[PDB]
């Protein structure tokens, strides 16, 4: 019953090295489209000048050709976006076109030459974006001054260091065909630079509270649980405390974001968690059931499956290990993180 369903999902889920990159594969029989996602390890936090977002714009260009125009003529919409630690290149298409579209995409991503006219043109485009969540977007876009201090040598060096197969994760969701090196020879287009070390530079009106007590998967469970618990208590008591989440694939720990003005009310609610002894145990039981229900519902949408692969590293981990981590969260884990949150809020 429940065990056979997790086994069903896991037999369609796989991850293997292809060339010098890794491809996470979730096959769906008779899906109408296939989602392909190329995720490069560089975002707004890897370099705080907006360089990653600048590179994302440059990556659409190769020898005067724009890959969005090439994909559009092939009937596919290429979408790109930069988050705090990654840059995503995502598109949907029929499975017969996946191999050629993917290899054409990696052809652009592993191109490392950008003339001055292309750099200056994209700078003007990005400055118009800066002049046109809000703190997160402007941090990714950078400022007009910060991107104006980077030239061709920097962008090309950054491309060679970060846009490599070793620093790339590929996710292909839907269909039934396997991804291999013969069809994507660009998966070996390497440079002299290996995978960059996970340097982060998390840079004053908010506080960042760590959720770190257990394995990588456990931290996501606890972080979602405590954030959901605090929001529920803030509703009944009609507070106005927003609780943001910092959950990144390259971070072993998870983090809660709360306004520094709302620190007092949030601190009170954290201490309010351990009041009702049955509240934590019943909310964990409700969350475990809700998590499984949402996963069953979400595993029909290609993009939602992709979000599980990036948040929970599904592929490296099985769905069995995901639910095993979920089922292992007890009230003692919550109380332990409750204590470390209170210690962080004290100082």
């Amino acid at each position: 019953l429940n065990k056979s369903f997790v086994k069903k999902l896991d037999e369609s889920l796989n991850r293997k090295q292809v060339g010098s990159t890794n491809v996470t594969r979730y096959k769906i029989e008779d899906s109408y489209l296939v989602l392909a996602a190329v995720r490069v390890g560089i975002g707004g936090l890897t370099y705080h000048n907006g360089a990653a977002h600048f590179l994302e714009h440059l990556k659409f260009w190769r020898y005067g050709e724009n890959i969005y125009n090439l994909f559009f003529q092939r009937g596919a919409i290429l979408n790109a976006y930069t988050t705090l630690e990654f840059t995503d290149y995502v598109f949907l298409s029929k499975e017969e076109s996946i191999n050629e579209n993917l290899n054409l995409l990696l052809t652009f991503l592993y191109h490392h030459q950008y003339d001055e006219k292309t750099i200056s043109l994209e700078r003007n485009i990005i400055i118009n974006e800066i002049n046109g969540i809000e703190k997160e977007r402007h941090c990714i876009l950078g400022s007009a001054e910060s991107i104006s201090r980077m030239g061709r040598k920097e962008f090309e060096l950054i491309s060679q260091k970060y846009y490599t197969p070793e620093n790339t994760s590929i996710y292909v969701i839907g269909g039934n065909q396997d991804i291999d090196l013969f069809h994507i020879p660009t998966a070996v287009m390497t440079t002299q630079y290996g995978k960059p070390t996970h340097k982060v530079n998390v840079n004053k009106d908010m506080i960042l509270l760590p959720v770190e007590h257990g394995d990588y998967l456990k931290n996501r469970m606890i972080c979602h649980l405590i954030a959901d618990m605090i929001k529920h208590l803030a509703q009944q008591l009609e507070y106005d405390v927003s609780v943001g989440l910092f959950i990144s694939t390259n971070q072993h720990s998870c983090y809660l974001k709360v306004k520094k003005s709302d620190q007092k009310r949030f601190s009170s609610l954290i201490q309010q968690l351990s009041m009702d002894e049955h509240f934590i145990e019943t909310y964990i039981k409700d969350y475990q059931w809700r998590f499984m229900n949402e996963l069953v519902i979400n595993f029909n949408q290609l993009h939602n499956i992709y979000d599980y692969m990036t948040e929970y590293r599904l592929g490296e981990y099985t769905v069995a290990e995901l639910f095993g981590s979920l089922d292992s969260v007890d009230k003692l884990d919550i109380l332990a993180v409750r204590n470390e949150l209170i210690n962080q809020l004290t100082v």
Binding site: L1, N2, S4, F5, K8, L9, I28, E29, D30, S31, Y32, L33, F72, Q73, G75, A76, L92, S93, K94, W289, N293, V296, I297, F299, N300, Q301, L302
Partner: protein
């Protein structure tokens, strides 16, 4: 027992099964005089029933009074984990009916104010949509009936005056949902089953006021409306949506290219009203004649037409990816268009001669400027 089992094979295999019932309210939704009452009671019923039915293995319960081509329909839906993958079997359709009839009247009264405020806010936010308000004000005047535009989600004055004595119309609504004849849809095992052959006869309102000018004075946008004559199912469901993407959506659309000479453009085909709208944010006076002359002298070519076919197929494929988009498609479409494969094949078989038939049947009907 069902009279038929219309099994459509080749469907995407989903993680859940779906059991849906579509009950026909044959009269056009403007002819229903208790429209605001029926909407409010249905949402109240849905909320109460959901609390009792949305337990394992049921993941989501759906009950709405929906409009499909200007005809009211009660649509009951059940999303659930398949029995082979669920620790508990799903209730039958008879037990779901029994849950609806076992709804307590005090439970409905507990939801009255919340449901009333929910629907009131939907009426306001749908009316308070500027770019669509131009389309709303046009549809109001083009059809001489506010039920097609402003009062489409219900009239505000009628909905805001509902009191809790609407509880006494709950037996009539429960009877209509449980005992009214309808079609059953069942998605399972990569197939969708339909209980009977029946095509919902479409209704499109006729334009009464032709050539509407919404001269509106306000301080800090334009909207033009077009229609088509002799509309076939192929046009309303495939060709015209392709035409809308051709002229105001698919990348370098005809309107973006035309209006970039002047130097925030949108277009949408309303299948309910058979109206193609074009919304664009002093300078609007030149854009008015520039848009009109562009649609009058519209031309096509087979290379760009083949790309619009590919794009619209992939957009339809993306809707079929969603189990609700698939279900809604199989409910609404006529005959063989219910089969997604047949619908996709019908897109692939369109030819450019179809666009010139559509251009000859196209005309302007209204314009709204704020």
């Amino acid at each position: 027992q069902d009279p038929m089992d219309i099994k459509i094979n080749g469907i995407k295999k989903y993680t859940i099964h779906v059991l849906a019932k579509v009950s026909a309210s044959g009269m056009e939704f403007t002819q229903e005089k208790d429209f605001e009452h029926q909407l409010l009671l249905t949402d109240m019923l849905e909320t109460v029933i959901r609390k009792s039915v949305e337990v394992n293995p049921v993941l989501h319960f759906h009950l709405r009074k929906s409009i499909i081509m200007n005809h009211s329909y009660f649509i009951l839906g059940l999303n659930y984990i398949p029995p082979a993958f669920a620790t508990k079997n799903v209730k039958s359709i008879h037990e779901i009916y029994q849950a609806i009839q076992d709804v307590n009247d005090l439970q409905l009264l507990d939801e009255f104010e919340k449901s009333k405020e929910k629907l009131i806010n939907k009426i306001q936010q749908y009316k308070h949509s500027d770019s669509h308000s131009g389309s709303i004000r046009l549809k109001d005047r083009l059809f001489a009936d506010k039920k097609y535009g402003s009062d489409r989600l219900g009239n505000f004055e009628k909905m805001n005056k509902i009191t809790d004595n609407i509880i006494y119309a709950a037996p009539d609504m429960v009877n209509k949902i449980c005992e009214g004849d309808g079609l059953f849809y069942h998605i399972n095992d990569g197939a969708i089953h339909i209980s009977n052959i029946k095509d919902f006869n479409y209704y499109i309102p006729a334009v009464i006021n032709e050539g509407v000018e919404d001269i509106r004075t306000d301080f800090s946008i334009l909207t033009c409306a077009y229609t088509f004559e002799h509309v076939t199912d192929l046009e309303r469901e495939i060709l015209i949506p392709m035409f809308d993407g051709y002229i105001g959506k698919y990348g370098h659309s005809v309107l973006f290219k035309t209006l970039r000479l002047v130097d925030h453009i949108s277009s949408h085909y309303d299948q309910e009203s058979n109206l193609l709208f074009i919304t664009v944010l002093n300078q609007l006076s030149t854009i008015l004649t520039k848009i009109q002359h562009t649609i009058e002298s519209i031309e096509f070519d087979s290379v760009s037409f083949s790309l619009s076919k590919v794009m619209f197929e992939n957009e339809s494929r993306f809707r079929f990816e969603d189990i609700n988009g698939l279900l809604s498609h199989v409910i609404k479409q006529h005959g063989e268009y219910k089969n997604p494969e047949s619908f996709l094949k019908a897109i692939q078989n369109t030819d450019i001669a179809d666009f010139y038939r559509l251009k000859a049947n196209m005309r302007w009907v209204g314009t709204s400027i704020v």
